[PDB]
Symmetry: C3
């Protein structure tokens, strides 16, 4: 484990995702509202999945070597197995908050799968220049997601209860800022141009992951928007 | 790329799926009917997924070598990753058109997963004679799907609006004819008996894919069956 | 095939899953109740999936070698591909029986995916002591599932029709007893401590699989709880 300088950030990430999972699990014990139960189930699964994948990276299972640039490059593939399941769950939290229609939910989840799937292909591609073709396709899929979150959901939240509109607006802004950083870290990190070393890259993804999952969840599950209007 | 004679058909397929995706995306911009939005989302995702997998084959990522018959045989595995997601989406288009019940939808999607999954196992199997055992199981799963589309959905469409009944009947006939060709191309192509060479096999799958996805989508999204009855 | 002593139990399992699939398929022909159709579709898919994965193990495709303990250990990975899809389908049978809320269904299916996913990682892990870390995480996920089936569903079934309450109680008890045996067989078998040899381990999993899928299905599909109350 300790033979890799980035191990400290993988261990911290593992701990923070595990602690986040347990807090949400305990906090959700005393909840019977069927609407609130939906948000607790979605939001608790997110850091639980991330916990297992951070642990796999810490123990060395989620790491492979990819030859490109005449070098064997360490690629943590477990990140994409994490994101494949956690990013659509996070979008479902937002879509259920605004009572989005089914067709829009399917478009979001499908574009998200394309985003993560093409990012994985780009991470494992051995022809250096082709890695950035996949990065560009994946980034186009992300821009579609961000467009929908702004010019489809925002207008839908305003016609909703005030507390669900204000909570959505906050979580929307958090998501757009944090998610946009991921393609940048990829491009300048060891998967892309190799400007930033792997140990610093790992620290950046850990800060982003914890903020986008645990921080996101703390804002959502403390809001009254997750409960139905009741007397 | 150009070192493979089949590259021209992979490049054409990539272009036609990309163009198809963009047309459906633009055409769906001016749509607010929640029913129509469902069909546009399903139908636009189909060629978008196929685009990415054709590109992976063009660039050489979606290709592996499988030893059988005393030879290293080029097997494009990316086809099955495509079909795993696009064939159930196409069946969902048909099932939603006739307002099929949930139990029937699950049976269709499950049989479809078995069809594609066993076809993938057959494509990667190293014992030559066993490849055709998997082909037979996969073909049995397809025949179940075709039976349901005829002796379960057809009777359901007649009790529906006339425009949804006539549109379903057309898309049903297109699907049964085109899908039935796939097991035949597999059997006589490089995955099976090896009668037809890979470059011709690739041309045939490209014609079938574009027809079953883009051609299918053009018929559906030009129909009024996708809109609810409104004044 | 016959070069492996466990082949006899893989062949028996294949036959019993295939026969089970055909019986459920025939029995479900004469069913039009939309509620009953749901249970028949879920319950017939379970042994059909298991059939294909037992066949892959029989023919040698679903087997790999994992080095640990200074030895190349035969690991049947196809079991986890089976369980990944069949265990959530079995939980869906139970959840639909008691009309569970959506949030609870998602929590069950998500915990089940974590259970199977971490068990697969543990089966393929090359550092011997780490294999049991994954076993423990997977077992914690199972205990969560069992808790929900007892202290969330049981109370919900009592407020239901008497026949659905008594049928659920029976299937609940069958599930908790049979599922609990799996982590024990893993721990003492070739994936874990290696006390029980592989051929005996394979026999035990076959008895458990057939009972948990075909036996489970025979109890459910003979009950009147799967039909709506009708005159
Ligand atoms: C009902 O809706 C509320 C349940 O949602 C919340 C239910 C959760 C979604 C269930 C998923 C958690 C499982 C219990 C998994 C247990 C293993 C975890 C990875 C444990 C990690 C923390 C600890 C080991 C440090
Ligand atoms: C509606 C939305 C959900 C739609 C989703 C969008 C999606 C279509 C976007 C594209 C996804 C696609 C790129 C997934 C590729 C997975 C692949 C990286 C797995 C590893 O295989 C890659 C190479 C080794 O580098 O295999 C070496 C050769 C091996 C012999 C490969 C044989 C196994 C194949 C991988 C079998 C295909 C399985 C499916 C891809 C499983 C789904 C994986 C997940 C990442 C989507
Ligand atoms: C709301 O419902 C309508 C949206 O459906 C339609 C929405 C679509 C389903 C969203 C999926 C498309 C994404 C925007 C993916 C973008 C990358 C594409 C693969 C681009 C391919 C064409 C071009 C690069 C040649
Ligand atoms: C309700 C419906 C959706 C049900 C679906 C029906 C489905 C059950 C039908 C059978 C599907 C099954 C054959 C999928 C097999 C995937 C497999 C080809 C992936 C590549 O692995 C094959 C060998 C190399 O040749 O791995 C070499 C050895 C490696 C060490 C393998 C270890 C990884 C395992 C593959 C882990 C299992 C992952 C799941 C199979 C992922 C789903 C893939 C998709 C193709 C279903
Ligand atoms: C409508 O709801 C009822 C259909 O459910 C029941 C429908 C089933 C869920 C459909 C799935 C079965 C498919 C027909 C697959 C056929 C291949 C099987 C694996 C055959 C195995 C048995 C035989 C080959 C020994
Ligand atoms: C809501 C719920 C459904 C959530 C589900 C819970 C889930 C997150 C729990 C953890 C699942 C995770 C451990 C799955 C790992 C699959 C992995 C074993 C496949 C084989 O790859 C392992 C190594 C060889 O030993 O690959 C060698 C290196 C290769 C180069 C690997 C590159 C391919 C990657 C495997 C791509 C990721 C694909 C996804 C993991 C596909 C889903 C598989 C299924 C088992 C979940
Ligand atoms: C909890 C994890 C989250 C919210 C991860 C989000 C990840 C992304 C938005 C990743 C995007 C990428 C691109 C847009 C292209 C480059 C490759 C990716 C996958 C890093
Ligand atoms: C857009 C792609 C489509 C509609 C693909 C359809 C593919 C099939 C219907 C494939 C069927 C197969 C068999 C029936 C057995 C032989 C292997 C397959 C997977 C080619
Ligand atoms: C039809 C198959 C069924 C119902 C299989 C159930 C399997 C389990 C409940 C497996 C549980 C495991 C653990 C709890 C940890 C050890 C590894 C597993 C996956 C065997
Ligand atoms: C979206 C965030 C990207 C900003 C990356 C900042 C990295 C600064 C760290 C110093 C770079 C290390 C280079 C010298 C080793
Ligand atoms: C009462 C609110 C705080 C509860 C404690 C939460 C502990 C989980 C770890 C959170 C750290 C990361 C927060 C986002 C920066
Ligand atoms: C379902 C369509 C299958 C028909 C295949 C027709 C192939 C004819 C092309 C000529 C065969 C090439 C053999 C000589 C190289
Ligand atoms: C107005 C209808 C035609 C629009 C142009 C569609 C261009 C997408 C490519 C379609 C070619 C394949 C059609 C099926 C044979
Ligand atoms: C949950 C069931 C686990 C019980 C396992 C009993 C196995 C007894 C078979 C004899 C053990 C073989 C050891 C000598 C070869
Ligand atoms: C009339 C009920 C029996 C029908 C025959 C079922 C045959 C399928 C194989 C069942 C054997 C396994 C039963 C569970 C132990
Ligand atoms: C490729 C993996 C995608 C599945 C991720 C799991 C979450 C799915 C959310 C589905 C939302 C409901 C759509 C109607
Ligand atoms: C990782 C694979 C999980 C999917 C298994 C297929 C069954 C899914 C059941 C979904 C139940 C409905 C949830 C609302
Ligand atoms: C185009 C939709 C408007 C909202 C999206 C904001 C774009 C942020 C740019 C992200 C940069 C990634 C490289
Ligand atoms: C048996 C259901 C009737 C409709 C299915 C038509 C069968 C077409 C044969 C396909 C040939 C594939 C080898
Ligand atoms: C803790 C929830 C109560 C019901 C679960 C029964 C636990 C059975 C123990 C299984 C042993 C697996 C190692
Ligand atoms: C080795 C660098 C080659 C540059 C390729 C950049 C491709 C980016 C595509 C974005 C449209
Ligand atoms: C090398 C050819 C061996 C023939 C096997 C055919 C199997 C087909 C099974 C269809 C029932
Ligand atoms: C080689 C045996 C090492 C023992 C590790 C046991 C780990 C079990 C963790 C359960 C909390
Ligand atoms: C609940 C605390 C979980 C912390 C265990 C993971 C941290 C790795 C320490 C080496
Ligand atoms: C929108 C046009 C997309 C065409 C790019 C793919 C074709 C491959 C050319 C080499
Ligand atoms: C319907 C009977 C299915 C039996 C075939 C599988 C058994 C393997 C025999 C070698
Ligand atoms: C993106 C930063 C999240 C901050 C988490 C703190 C929330 C406390 C309510
Ligand atoms: C299967 C052939 C499809 C033909 C596509 C043309 C549709 C234009 C309306
Ligand atoms: C767990 C044992 C199941 C027994 C199956 C027999 C059911 C006949 C109704
Ligand atoms: C990490 C355990 C949390 C302790 C309870 C927090 C207040 C519900
Ligand atoms: C109005 C809410 C602002 C939230 C933005 C937070 C950016 C990290
Ligand atoms: C909408 C604000 C985008 C912020 C992008 C930050 C990328 C590091
Ligand atoms: C009555 C519609 C006929 C459609 C059949 C088209 C076959 C390619
Ligand atoms: C229902 C007509 C079937 C046509 C099969 C064509 C196979 C090449
Ligand atoms: C009251 C029903 C008892 C069922 C338990 C069966 C254990 C195999
Ligand atoms: C609730 C009874 C548990 C039985 C466990 C059996 C494990 C072999």
């Amino acid at each position: 484990i300790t033979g890799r300088p980035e191990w400290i950030w993988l261990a911290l990430g593992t701990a923070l995702m595990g602690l986040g999972t347990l807090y949400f699990l305990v906090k959700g014990m005393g909840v019977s509202d069927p609407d609130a139960k939906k948000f607790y189930a979605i939001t608790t699964l997110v850091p639980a999945i991330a916990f297992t994948m951070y642990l796999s990276m810490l123990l060395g299972y989620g790491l492979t070597m990819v030859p490109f640039g005449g070098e064997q490059n360490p690629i943590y593939w477990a990140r994409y197995a994490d994101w494949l399941f956690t990013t659509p769950l996070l979008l479902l939290d937002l879509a259920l908050l605004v009572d989005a229609d089914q067709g829009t939910i399917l478009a979001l989840v499908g574009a998200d799968g394309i985003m993560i799937g093409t990012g994985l292909v780009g991470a494992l591609t051995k022809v250096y220049s082709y890695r950035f073709v996949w990065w560009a396709i994946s980034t186009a899929a992300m821009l579609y997601i961000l467009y929908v979150l702004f010019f489809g959901f925002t207008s839908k939240a305003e016609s909703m209860r005030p507390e669900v509109a204000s909570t959505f607006k906050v979580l929307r802004n958090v998501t757009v800022v944090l998610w946009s950083a991921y393609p940048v870290v990829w491009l300048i990190g060891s998967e892309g141009a190799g400007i930033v070393p792997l140990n610093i890259e790992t620290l950046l993804f850990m800060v982003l992951d914890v903020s986008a999952k645990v921080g996101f969840g703390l804002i959502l599950l403390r809001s009254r928007a997750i409960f139905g209007e009741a007397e």
